[PDB]
Design an enzyme around this catalytic site. Sequence first.
Site, mmCIF file in Angstrom:
data_model
loop_
_atom_site.group_PDB
_atom_site.id
_atom_site.type_symbol
_atom_site.label_atom_id
_atom_site.label_comp_id
_atom_site.label_asym_id
_atom_site.label_seq_id
_atom_site.Cartn_x
_atom_site.Cartn_y
_atom_site.Cartn_z
ATOM 1 N N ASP A 1 0.895 -1.175 -0.027
ATOM 2 C CA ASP A 1 -0.066 -0.059 0.068
ATOM 3 C C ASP A 1 0.879 1.397 -0.047
ATOM 4 O O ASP A 1 2.044 1.219 0.397
ATOM 5 C CB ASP A 1 -0.955 -0.075 1.286
ATOM 6 C CG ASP A 1 -2.085 -1.161 1.254
ATOM 7 O OD1 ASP A 1 -2.900 -1.182 0.682
ATOM 8 O OD2 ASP A 1 -1.597 -2.031 1.979
ATOM 9 N N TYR B 1 2.521 4.828 1.142
ATOM 10 C CA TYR B 1 2.560 5.361 2.535
ATOM 11 C C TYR B 1 1.087 5.857 2.878
ATOM 12 O O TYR B 1 0.765 6.880 2.072
ATOM 13 C CB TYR B 1 3.514 6.442 2.634
ATOM 14 C CG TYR B 1 5.042 6.050 2.405
ATOM 15 C CD1 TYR B 1 5.656 5.432 3.603
ATOM 16 C CD2 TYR B 1 5.850 6.506 1.323
ATOM 17 C CE1 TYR B 1 7.138 4.756 3.295
ATOM 18 C CE2 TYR B 1 7.196 6.055 1.112
ATOM 19 C CZ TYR B 1 7.944 5.212 2.113
ATOM 20 O OH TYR B 1 9.240 4.703 2.129
ATOM 21 N N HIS C 1 11.712 -13.392 0.865
ATOM 22 C CA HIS C 1 10.815 -12.309 0.857
ATOM 23 C C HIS C 1 10.589 -11.417 2.037
ATOM 24 O O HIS C 1 9.802 -10.786 2.554
ATOM 25 C CB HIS C 1 9.688 -12.519 0.276
ATOM 26 C CG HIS C 1 9.413 -13.457 -0.978
ATOM 27 N ND1 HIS C 1 8.944 -14.736 -0.831
ATOM 28 C CD2 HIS C 1 10.124 -13.410 -2.045
ATOM 29 C CE1 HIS C 1 9.206 -15.352 -1.940
ATOM 30 N NE2 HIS C 1 9.898 -14.769 -2.602
#
Length: 224
Positions: free
Chosen positions: A65, A67, A188
């Site tokens: 998403d 900031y 990851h």
Amino acid sequence: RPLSELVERGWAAALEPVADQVAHMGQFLRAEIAAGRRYLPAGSNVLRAFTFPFDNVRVLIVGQDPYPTPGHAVGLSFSVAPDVRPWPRSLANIFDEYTADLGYPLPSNGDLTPWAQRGVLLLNRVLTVRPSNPASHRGKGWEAVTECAIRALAARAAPLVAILWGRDASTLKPMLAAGNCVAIESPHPSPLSASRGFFGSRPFSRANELLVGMGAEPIDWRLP
Ligand SMILES: NC1=NC(=O)NC(=O)C1
Ligand SMILES: [Cl-]
């Protein structure tokens, strides 16, 4: 406005399957304003990652998403404007890995536009957020858009290295599976993992080893 007016030519073709969904997201954002809610980044920056040429993308960095703090998101994942300081934590962590991995001095500012200009796609899975409300536009329709983008890159004949710095890394891996010259960096860790997996992950040098091994030019990662 049609895609051809919003994004770079190659991207406009790549994103044609989601042309109507992009227009739908424009309507969603208008409705948010009409409902008295705000969004970030600015409208003019929402599709900014797709304003650099599709055909030269060689590395994909995927976040989750934008900031959530006003004045941070600028439409390139993890980047901030060059007058923003202090840097957000995630970006400070990215830069501490940059220095360690590559041996370059700490950057002067947080603008990742040079990476975008060199073929790094700084993508978030969700392209807007309500300020102060982290992940608030999850499930509102961006996911089909960004999935389309990812699958389009993977269907190109060209080499691609993917770096997964978002929560959904495991949902994203299969999207990258069909690409004949696609390498996905594993494991990851995300920037906020810090010394529990992110530091020492060597994402930049490994990307270049993989690109070179596939016969592509490396990315110049240097920042001022
Ligand atoms: N802190 C951030 N996390 C992300 O996943 N993407 C951004 O653009 C910023
Ligand atoms: Cl952060």
